[PDB]
Amino acid sequence: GGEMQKIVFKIPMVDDKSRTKAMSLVASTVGVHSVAIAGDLRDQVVVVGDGIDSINLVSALRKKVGPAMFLEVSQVKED
């Protein structure tokens, strides 16, 4: 498929339940290959995949997990 995408969100997350919900929601999104929680505060949600509708994904995160913001949009360096 295409060169992969990397999308990072910042989502204030009260605890590990919130984190678990975010990871489950993201993992169930079309195009997602992997997702992790990262960052100094454990509030960076790092998403990798191909053909992710980041529009819809941010909306879903805002409804179900918390006040998500984009931090980064980039392509994976594959070569």
Binding site: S34, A38, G39, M69, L71, E72, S74, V76, K77, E78
Partner: protein, 84 residues
């Protein structure tokens, strides 16, 4: 309260995703010398990042030096990870 010193910064809290190449650089974002967050990124590459109030196109060179139009008070600094 120290001046920015990457030699004294703890590493980012990162995750290397298994299906893609390991990124070569650590990045660290500061606002008036206070660490805001940190992560990983590729060398010899590019990304768009939210730095304080603004989206910034950030380029990395082969030694993980980061460049871009950072807004006042803010900086994103890079360094090579061990073994890269």
């Amino acid at each position: 309260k120290r001046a920015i010193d990457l030699s004294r910064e703890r590493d980012p809290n990162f995750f290397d995703h298994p299906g893609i190449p390991v990124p070569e650089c650590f990045w660290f974002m500061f606002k008036n010398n206070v660490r805001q967050d940190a992560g990983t990124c590729y060398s010899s590459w590019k990304m768009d990042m939210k730095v304080g109030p603004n989206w910034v196109h950030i380029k990395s060179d082969d030694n993980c030096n980061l460049s871009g139009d950072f807004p006042p008070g803010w900086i994103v600094l890079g360094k090579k990870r061990p073994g890269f």
